[PDB]
């Protein structure tokens, strides 16, 4: 049900401290927000110019290149979210 | 809130399974027949639960 889905999303958000939002540049980009307080985030575009878009703690090209490979070549969203989270948290 | 279905799929694609009938969260990182079980009926902080889940999702 729509009610139960909303409740499960809220719990996932609390447990993972991961929220999935529309992208602040293109609303159809996806913005992953890490943390209670929007302390870290990264945006990805599906079929545009940049696969990996902006990210609040900006990331060097080596790091961005690694993230694109995890996401486009490996096609592993968990792995991408794990690496991106570590990378962003470590650039704060 | 039609986006909520897709969000739940994304979360489940990480291998994190809400299992509230048992008041716990399951973590299936390897699909090898082993699970991590995180109880919610405890005094663990939100910070500790979040740190644990991401620790298990990592390597």
């Amino acid at each position: 049900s729509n009610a139960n889905d909303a409740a499960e999303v809220a719990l996932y958000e609390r447990l993972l401290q991961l929220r999935v939002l529309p992208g602040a540049s293109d609303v159809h980009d996806v913005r992953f927000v890490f943390g209670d307080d929007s302390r870290c985030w990264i945006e990805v575009a599906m079929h545009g110019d940049h696969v990996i878009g902006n990210s609040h703690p900006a990331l060097d090209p080596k790091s961005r290149a690694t993230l694109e490979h995890v996401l486009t070549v490996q096609g592993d969203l968990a792995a991408f979210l794990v690496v991106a989270r570590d990378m962003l948290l470590a650039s704060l | 809130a039609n986006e909520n279905i897709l969000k739940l799929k994304l979360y489940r694609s990480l291998g994190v399974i809400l299992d509230l009938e048992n008041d716990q969260v399951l973590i299936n990182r390897k699909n090898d027949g082993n699970i991590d079980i995180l109880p919610l009926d405890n005094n663990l902080s939100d910070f500790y639960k979040t740190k644990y889940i991401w620790e298990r999702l990592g390597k």
Binding site: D29, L77 | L6, L10
Partner: peptide
């Protein structure tokens, strides 16, 4: 790739 695609179509 299909999960992000579905989220992008919904957000759009």
């Amino acid at each position: 790739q299909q999960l992000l695609k579905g989220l992008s179509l919904s957000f759009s």
